[PDB]
């Protein structure tokens, strides 16, 4: 698993 | 191609120097997607920059070549991304592209501006 | 940081032959893999996405396959616009990293 974010909440 | 990002701010700048980037994008709904900055130095290769978070933006990345240095946001009222650029040096002088992540989930970039040009030089 | 090693450097070509380029990454990345066209002076387009997924609008003579560590871009046959330059790009991890590129120049 990557360990980035691209859509928050 | 319906989808543009249109850098601004480039320029000549001094070592020690500051100067801000803008990209404009139009043809997609902006605060849906994550957006980067990705430079090409002269006569080299991509290298990623700095990537940011939809919608509001809270979750940004920076290669370590630029951390505390360059801030990346945006304002999604005028669909503008931002490249803050402090304590400029020689070696960031390249072509500063705008880019847009093609999913909800990757910043791997699908659509990209024309590019701006930033010299670094005393 | 993953290191993503293309090569070869440099792939010497007529219009009509196959072409295949590699990229290999320091550690496994799964499939997010993604592969980009650049010409002089122009912007990047992006041919293959995550998955080895073929862009829309992309001619079907462009295509990825592999995954983990060893990803290959094949052109099953050469058009004259298809010489260019080519990078590989990871979206497993932050930082994103780049190939160092290949170009596919005119073999005479």
């Known amino acids: 698993k990557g360990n980035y974010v691209v859509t928050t909440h | 191609s319906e989808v543009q990002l249109v850098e601004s701010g480039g320029g000549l700048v001094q070592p020690g120097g500051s100067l801000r980037l803008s990209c404009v994008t139009s043809?997609?709904?902006?605060?849906?997607?994550?957006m980067s900055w990705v430079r090409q130095a002269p006569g080299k290769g991509l290298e990623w920059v700095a990537s940011?978070?939809?919608?509001?933006?809270?979750?940004?990345y920076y290669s370590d070549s630029v951390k505390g240095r360059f801030t990346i946001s945006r304002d999604n009222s005028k669909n503008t991304l931002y490249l803050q650029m402090n304590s400029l040096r020689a070696e960031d002088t390249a072509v500063y592209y705008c880019?847009?992540?093609?999913?909800?989930?990757?910043?791997?970039?699908?659509?990209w501006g024309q590019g701006t040009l930033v010299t670094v030089s005393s | 940081d993953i290191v993503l090693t293309q090569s070869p450097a440099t792939l010497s070509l007529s219009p009509g032959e196959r072409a295949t380029l590699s990229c290999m990454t320091s550690?496994?990345?799964?499939?997010?893999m993604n592969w980009y066209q650049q010409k002089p002076g122009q912007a990047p387009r992006l041919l293959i996405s995550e998955g080895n997924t073929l862009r829309p609008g992309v001619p079907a003579r462009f295509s990825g396959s592999g995954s983990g560590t060893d990803f290959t871009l094949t052109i099953s046959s050469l058009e004259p616009e298809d010489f260019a330059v080519y990078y590989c790009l990871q979206s497993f991890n932050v930082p994103l990293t780049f190939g160092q590129g290949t170009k596919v120049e005119i073999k005479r």
């Open positions: 043809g997609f709904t902006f605060r849906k997607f994550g």
């Open positions: 550690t496994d990345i799964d499939d997010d």
């Open positions: 940011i978070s939809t919608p509001r933006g809270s979750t940004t």
């Open positions: 880019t847009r992540g093609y999913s909800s989930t990757s910043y791997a970039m699908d659509y």
